[PDB]
Write a protein that binds this ligand. Sequence first.
Ligand SMILES: O=C(NCCOc1ccccc1)c1nc([C@@H]2CCCN2C(=O)CSc2ccccc2Cl)[nH]c(=O)c1O
Ligand SMILES: [Cl-]
Ligand SMILES: [Mn+2]
Ligand SMILES: [Mn+2]
Length: 178
Amino acid sequence: RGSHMEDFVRQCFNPMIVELAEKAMKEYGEDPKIETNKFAAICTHLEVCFMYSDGGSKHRFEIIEGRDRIMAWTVVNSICNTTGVEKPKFLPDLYDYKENRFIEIGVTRREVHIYYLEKANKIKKTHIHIFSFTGEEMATKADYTLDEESRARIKTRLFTIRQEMASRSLWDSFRQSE
Ligand SMILES: O=C(NCCOc1ccccc1)c1nc([C@@H]2CCCN2C(=O)CSc2ccccc2Cl)[nH]c(=O)c1O
Ligand SMILES: [Cl-]
Ligand SMILES: [Mn+2]
Ligand SMILES: [Mn+2]
């Protein structure tokens, strides 16, 4: 039972992202063949996390997302036990060695302010950075970590993804799936 959305995800995202996404959902008991919008959302978030860590200097970011849950907590333990930063209650996506804070990266198909609130209500010290499929962004204390060009090409890619699904009539299903 193979959807259009699943075939589009495999042709739209690079194979390392797709496989990390697949491992992730299976690890949490989800099927990329069925929960195809989530499949698409996971790849998107993953690609945004990787572009984001690429925007800094060489050694600036540790990448927490995309790892096995046990190994992700292992690295945050090490980060915490060497920088003296409080251990987050939930797994974040990155750690910033320059600013010494964990980052939760968000990608939403709804309005900037709500997901941040939803995200901030659940987080309760880590930095939050939200990106939209429309090109809006919001970060904690209005501190956006990266320079403008790095975030700009993230927004550019999100909108390209938007168009590629719209041209395949899959955008409507994806927007109202969140
Ligand atoms: O790391 C995360 N979860 C760890 C576990 O995730 C899986 C992995 C596979 C299957 C089920 C959960 C994480 N999760 C969330 C949302 C809200 C909290 C649970 N959640 C989700 O299940 C939505 S899947 C999602 C959707 C859009 C963007 C990104 C993602 Cl991951 N959003 C994030 O930005 C994020 O990093
Ligand atoms: Cl930098
Ligand atoms: Mn994450
Ligand atoms: Mn995230």
